[PDB]
Amino acid sequence: LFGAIAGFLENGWEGMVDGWYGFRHQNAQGTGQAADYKSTQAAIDQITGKLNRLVEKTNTEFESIESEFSEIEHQIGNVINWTKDSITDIWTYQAELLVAMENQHTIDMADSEMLNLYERVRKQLRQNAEEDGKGCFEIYHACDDSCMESIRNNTYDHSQYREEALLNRLN
Amino acid sequence: LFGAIAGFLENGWEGMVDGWYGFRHQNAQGTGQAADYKSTQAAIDQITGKLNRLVEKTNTEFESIESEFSEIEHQIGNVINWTKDSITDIWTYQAELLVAMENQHTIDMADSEMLNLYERVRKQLRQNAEEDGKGCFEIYHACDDSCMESIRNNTYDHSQYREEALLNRLN
Amino acid sequence: LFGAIAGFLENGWEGMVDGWYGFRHQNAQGTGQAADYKSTQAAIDQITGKLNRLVEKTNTEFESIESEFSEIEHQIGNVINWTKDSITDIWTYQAELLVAMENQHTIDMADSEMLNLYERVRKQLRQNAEEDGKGCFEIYHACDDSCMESIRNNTYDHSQYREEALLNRLN
Amino acid sequence: DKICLGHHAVANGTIVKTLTNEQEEVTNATETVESTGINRLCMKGRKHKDLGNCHPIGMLIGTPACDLHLTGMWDTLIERENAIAYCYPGATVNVEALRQKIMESGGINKISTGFTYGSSINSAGTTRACMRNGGNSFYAELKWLVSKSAGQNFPQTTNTYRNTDTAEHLIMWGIHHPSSTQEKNTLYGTQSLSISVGSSTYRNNFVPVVGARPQVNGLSSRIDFHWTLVQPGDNITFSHNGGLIAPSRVSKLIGRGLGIQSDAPIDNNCESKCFWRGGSINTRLPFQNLSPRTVGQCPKYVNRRSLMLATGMRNVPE
Amino acid sequence: DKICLGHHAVANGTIVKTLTNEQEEVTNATETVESTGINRLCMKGRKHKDLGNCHPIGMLIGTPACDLHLTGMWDTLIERENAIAYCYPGATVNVEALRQKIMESGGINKISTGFTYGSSINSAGTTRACMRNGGNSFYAELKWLVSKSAGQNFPQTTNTYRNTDTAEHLIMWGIHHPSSTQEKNTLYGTQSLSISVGSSTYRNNFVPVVGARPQVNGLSSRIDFHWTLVQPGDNITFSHNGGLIAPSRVSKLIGRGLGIQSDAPIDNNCESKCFWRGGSINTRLPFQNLSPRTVGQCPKYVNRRSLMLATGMRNVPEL
Amino acid sequence: DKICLGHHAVANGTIVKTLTNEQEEVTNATETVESTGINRLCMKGRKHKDLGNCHPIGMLIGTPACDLHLTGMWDTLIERENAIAYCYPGATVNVEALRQKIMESGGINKISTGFTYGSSINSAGTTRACMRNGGNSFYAELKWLVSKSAGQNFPQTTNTYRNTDTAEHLIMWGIHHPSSTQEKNTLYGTQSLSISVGSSTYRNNFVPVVGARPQVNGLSSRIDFHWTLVQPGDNITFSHNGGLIAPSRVSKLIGRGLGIQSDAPIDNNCESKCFWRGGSINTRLPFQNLSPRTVGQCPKYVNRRSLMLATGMRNVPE
């Protein structure tokens, strides 16, 4: 577990129908929201991958060894029953394990793509910002809606605001 | 693997017993050791989930296809042996796999929960402390026992010590 | 997924042929490159551990149940055919799962060792350096080929450069 | 000023199982166990034969119900529950092995034995048990030999079929078991009856036995069928005293096909590769819980009603 | 002034295998493979029948050893290692199919055939090979028909059993293979012997084979047994003139039960759902290494003595 | 002034599959599915017998082709295609079970039955069909009993074999099915032929099935074989009249060996534990796609050319 999605982030955003992960900002000119496309597509692509593998199976032709409409000699029938049931136990077990292990990875993968976004934005902000425990960055300079976009756009230039930001952090 | 257990944490505390994960601190009044219940439960609960899935028993009823006390016709005897042996190889390999795969996940989930506690404290301490590298936080102010509990309780407000601690970090 | 390989590391280094992970440095005297032995061995060991399980051969002896050179009775033949194809679908499925899962984990494990090399260096440098988000640390004092070595070597004493570094970070 | 990171959620999550959690709630999920099938045998793209009430054995010996299925080609052979093999009551030795051989075949050709019998033999025995065109008939591919002069000893007779073909032939015969002494005598005489059959890969002796037994389709006597494979170039000889139910044609199973036993009506406008008693399964899911008995290329049967694969993150609502 | 993080550890940790490490030390671990079974047959909760020295086949024909096992109801039938089927030497055609059918049943009722024989037939033949009260007797469910007058031709006889019930019935008969021409002639006459057996679904016929054979219980004769299921509303007719060991009752197999082959002693104080030759197995574990051959609802057998499942974190003790 | 972290990469990586990604490039991978076998039967460290053109059934009855293979010890037995079991036309009842027993054994001894015959029996019957060293001969382990004087009734004969050893013995006999009643009367007389075979746990009767008419139809002379195990301390009796092909030796299967059907040349410098029709498989990989039919200690067969296991990180070239 990568400590974010059901961790230091309080909860999800039912309001974000735009994607899997995103940003909510507050500045002088109010509040706003945008989903981050790269990350959500990183997770989604991985899901569709698991799904492709799930339905890949190209299959062996089997014929009947059990008459539907006539009786089968008892001993051979009992061997067939024991086999078919053994095979079915194996598949039931593999299906259960496939799903459970896959579901573990899927959840944790999604937790990961979220931590990765977070960390990108953290490094991007450098010394111009600090974290609260809950997944936000308290930015120590006035950030323009144009500036907010540059954080999501991944084009934000930290040196530009550093002087201003640093004074505010220490005073 | 996450960075901590058998990682940047040199070793574990045989002396700790009221939990899997815990805090040790040193201040003016002396030393102290307190297990973290929240993180210890996060791990244990996940373990009990594995054990639960382990004993979840699917109940296929099998009958005998191999007489214990009389002769089995030779050709059918060989099919039965071959089938039973092929099934046992499958279950044996599946048993080996299950345990190896599960053990890998358990150990790393354990590592994970440690890193999460460490991360939770770090974000908590904010700019009033600095990381040891060995898993400790040098707090750059005076923190009495109630201040320690406040760190463990997740009730520590950093802004209260910030200006004092910041001055110590800078000089 | 950890954030590094194919993450905030833009790409791998083809010119680094003496380890899986390493260091490229820049100081006034020039450019340098070295591999980190401990991290790359942590990875190779785990790979070889996996390979060891692969070739694990405590194996069951099987005998023929169908004749290469003469005819089998039709009905027991069809049973045998159904059983053998069933067993083979299971092994074919297990083989695919094994390497799909194994590969997933290998990719991610390698990624974490990269991150742990990164996290180690970060905590070493402490307040004397800052992250550029592409895997590099910008160091706020002259760093000697010898000083770089102390970083790769894990003997960098940050306090030795703290004063100088802290005022270079601010001015 | 501040910026915040987050993930989406929904009001109504889906429970899925993990390695650690029975009850884990995620955003979306999808089924991996197929539970619905098609109520038709989807035979589009297949050269298929629906046998109706004709049982595969009945094709080889020519029971009236199989008159439309005495020869053909198919890649798929459909057997039905009401299937008739025997008009005249009796049984076949190694019947299920033979049924399975027919049901994996890709067709059947019929080849005349060419058997001729002298004037002492009536080869046109018929019975009310085998009606054909409103009249007494008999297995189309077989001949019921009896004494032409009633009560006279059926003559010592030798018949030989030669496989001059390049593939094996399946040949069938019957052995009449009369239901009384009077009837045995009328049909074959008072002499001791003996029928022996032989080829390079087969030898056997049969003796008609008189026995009281229940009436089936009005009749207390039986006809037991036997069969063997006659390899190319080889010859098989019947040596008989009376009681032989002689082949007038033999069979040739050709190629391969998929045998299906089903209840379901044919749909020649849909395609499938997976069949069962109830019809067809067309799915991309790797598991199914419809039926432990399928043929063709199927997902695998599992003892589970549902297995959900998460297709989204943990769902944590507001 | 500092606060530190750390995990617990233990002096004695246990090794498990992982994907990358066959020698990985951890705090707690726990077994997944059951290695200890109960060397008793746990029958608490089961209405069981312990056949003792009575073989399942002998229940249907009524060999003396099975006289307390000629009828009954059970969900668990226990068969023992040297159980007796045949007091008189001989064997059953398709025996294992039949034994399996009985070991799958949940009980047996018996139904008289009502067979009667004319005056010139002695139907109370007995042998020293099948004893009751230390005296000559015979299979309880069968009759050894011989000519009442020695050396005389055994009459042509018809016997018909009619299944008037709504379930199928299991009928068994014997064919006597004499030890010499002399004996054969004495019992059945010099005529040729022919037994035919006919129902709607079954037809077969049998000829007693005279021949020198090793003495089993001082007897070179054999009685071989034969059987068939008779459907509701159907009849099976025996036409015969010497050599038939005729059924006096037939059997009805009822419902379902689990068949166990084992010499382990019964124990009514513990229950189980999984059994093998050496007893029972009771365990929550999914795998076991006791026996590859089990009946009931069992952990899967595996070729491993031990598989430890890590139930704790990595063990990193103090230097 | 700066220190950078990074990882290696290669000019040419390898595509592997993951849970979330087919076509995932990594720095290195290794194959898990062995597709390469060696076309030889590696017998180093194996005490083996290559039977050449001798069929395992031929060992028990002494067909000329198996003269060098009537006894032996081995841990490995190798059968070749088209091996000869019979020199005279006929076949073995229940043959495939017997052949598996022999191919499950670790050797064979022979024990004389000690059978002797009265003066009116010729026990040295031979045939042109079983040539040995240029002369009419017969199966080495059997005797063809006929009437010393042609046309006369073969006497009622009894022969008993007693196992006095502590292990079960495998006894084989033959039954002659004459080509015609004329040949049958010459060899054995006009009486009715009967062959009974009885032990404590086995009884059977056989009646020669007399052929007919031309020698070149399907009912001509054959000798068919039968077998059974004789437990220690038990006797088996043959009561017969003409038509028994009696054993002069019985066999004793010993220990376990591994049976191989292959036409791969034997290689003795070479050691293996896994074999198939086309040779051996020596590999450490847990899977192979060589063949679904292997015996010995084998990697599991799978229907995949290649399953690559990653041995390095993601390859991320500049």
Ligand SMILES: CC(=O)N[C@@H]1[C@@H](O)[C@H](O[C@@H]2O[C@H](CO[C@]3(C(=O)O)C[C@H](O)[C@@H](NC(C)=O)[C@H]([C@H](O)[C@H](O)CO)O3)[C@H](O)[C@H](O)[C@H]2O)[C@@H](CO)O[C@H]1O
């Ligand atoms: C018919 C008769 O009594 N003949 C005398 C033989 O019994 C006797 O040989 C001895 O036979 C013994 C077996 O005798 C029984 C038996 O218990 O098995 C006696 C039964 O009453 C008889 N029952 C019936 C229905 O026939 C039974 C039966 O005939 C046989 O089992 C058929 O084999 O035989 C025992 O085997 C002794 O070892 C044997 O010597 C001979 C010699 O005394 O004289 C006969 O008159």
Ligand SMILES: CC(=O)N[C@@H]1[C@@H](O)[C@H](O[C@@H]2O[C@H](CO[C@]3(C(=O)O)C[C@H](O)[C@@H](NC(C)=O)[C@H]([C@H](O)[C@H](O)CO)O3)[C@H](O)[C@H](O)[C@H]2O)[C@@H](CO)O[C@H]1O
């Ligand atoms: C009994 C005899 O010699 N009769 C003469 C026939 O042999 C002969 O027909 C020819 O028979 C040939 C086979 O002869 C053998 C054999 O198989 O080699 C000769 C063996 O000595 C003899 N051995 C025994 C134990 O009897 C053997 C045996 O009887 C048969 O195999 C049983 O079928 O036969 C061969 O098949 C020729 O093709 C055939 O013409 C006829 C015609 O010459 O005259 C008989 O007097």
Ligand SMILES: *[C@@H]1O[C@H](CO)[C@@H](O[C@@H]2O[C@H](CO)[C@@H](O)[C@H](O)[C@H]2NC(C)=O)[C@H](O)[C@H]1NC(C)=O
């Ligand atoms: C096989 O036959 C032999 C003799 O035909 C039987 O052995 C005799 O057995 C009795 C009692 O066991 C001894 O008194 C004799 O000394 C034995 N004869 C010899 C010379 O050993 C043997 O019992 C028969 N086996 C079976 C199973 O019937």
Ligand SMILES: CC(=O)N[C@H]1[C@H]([C@H](O)[C@H](O)CO)O[C@@](O)(C(=O)O)C[C@@H]1O
């Ligand atoms: C070949 C022959 O005899 N055909 C006659 C048969 C047989 O005699 C009995 O089926 C044998 O018992 O009996 C019939 O009554 C019948 O079956 O309709 C009339 C038919 O002409």
Ligand SMILES: *[C@@H]1O[C@H](CO)[C@@H](O)[C@H](O)[C@H]1NC(C)=O
């Ligand atoms: C639910 O899953 C299916 C298949 O994975 C997909 O078609 C659909 O878009 C998903 N729905 C949502 C809510 O995303």
Ligand SMILES: *[C@@H]1O[C@H](CO)[C@@H](O)[C@H](O)[C@H]1NC(C)=O
């Ligand atoms: C069964 O026996 C009864 C009594 O004779 C008779 O009415 C009935 O016809 C028989 N059934 C058959 C199938 O012959």
Ligand SMILES: *[C@@H]1O[C@H](CO)[C@@H](O)[C@H](O)[C@H]1NC(C)=O
């Ligand atoms: C089959 O019969 C033909 C014609 O008589 C003959 O040429 C051939 O040899 C016979 N086949 C065999 C194998 O006897």
Ligand SMILES: *[C@@H]1O[C@H](CO)[C@@H](O)[C@H](O)[C@H]1NC(C)=O
């Ligand atoms: C671990 O479990 C075992 C058995 O379940 C038990 O004996 C032991 O007391 C437990 N110890 C811990 C909590 O480490």
